[PDB]
């Protein structure tokens, strides 16, 4: 987030970090329940990659993070790599997340759900703060 | 890339108003937000765009793409969860 603010620890429970086996965070994600994580199809998530929940400070070794293994990657077959449309992939966890004060699920809208322009929302993650 | 989790408030735009910036690259399963002074950037992808509905934080978008320079005047593009929740419900049921 370029021009964002530091979040309050534990305040965005569903936010998870996707990292390869090198430790590198490439994408973010969201826990929709204890065994499923939603991320972007363009992220290119394999099963060599790991889901990390309960994290705030990536450089803090004292944190009680949860390193979750991916069982299967369910890419949306209506995903278009050329237009980058229908950019959503589900990740079935081989090991279920333990929900706590810091690890939990965000709510999913109804297909019928309505979100008007001019409405203020929130985005989170560990992406570049400057370019 | 920051060590700790960041956050940013930003408004939802209309696709029509967003096509003014991105034209025909904006498709039906995409929803824009930004041009407000903040911008999602590389590494934020896959991440959540949440709005409160009935006092509960609900998934409205997935950090997808935008400005190569993460320009805070240019709207970011997120995957429209409203259009993609049917497939998710179908997938979780069957697996």
């Amino acid at each position: 987030i370029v021009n964002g603010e530091e979040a309050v620890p534990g305040s965005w429970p569903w936010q998870v970090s996707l990292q390869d086996k090198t430790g590198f965070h490439f994408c973010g994600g969201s826990l929709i329940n204890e065994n499923w994580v939603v991320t972007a199809a363009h992220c290119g998530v394999t099963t060599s990659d790991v889901v990390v929940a309960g994290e705030f400070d990536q450089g803090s070794s004292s944190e009680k993070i949860q390193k979750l293994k991916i069982a299967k990657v369910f890419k949306n077959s209506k995903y278009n790599s050329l237009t980058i449309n229908n950019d959503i992939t589900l990740l079935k966890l081989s090991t279920a997340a333990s929900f706590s004060q810091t690890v939990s699920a965000v709510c999913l809208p109804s297909a019928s759900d309505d979100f008007a322009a001019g409405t203020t929302c929130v985005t989170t993650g560990w992406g570049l703060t400057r370019y | 890339t920051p060590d700790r989790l960041q956050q940013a408030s930003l408004p939802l735009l209309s696709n029509t108003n967003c096509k003014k910036y991105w034209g025909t690259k904006i498709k039906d399963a995409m929803i824009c937000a930004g041009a407000s002074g903040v911008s999602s950037c590389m590494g934020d992808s896959g991440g959540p765009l949440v709005c409160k509905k009935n006092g509960a934080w609900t998934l409205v978008g997935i950090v997808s793409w935008g400005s190569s320079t993460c320009s805070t005047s240019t709207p970011g593009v997120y995957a429209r969860v409203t259009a993609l929740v049917n497939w998710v419900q179908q997938t979780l049921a069957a697996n």
Binding site: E5, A7, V8, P9, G10, S11, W12, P13, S100, Q101, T102, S104, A105, V106, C107, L108, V122 | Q7, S9, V50, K52, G55, A56, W57, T58
Partner: peptide, 10 residues
Amino acid sequence: CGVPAIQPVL
């Protein structure tokens, strides 16, 4: 869902 134990501050 949608209601964190630790509350956000914007």
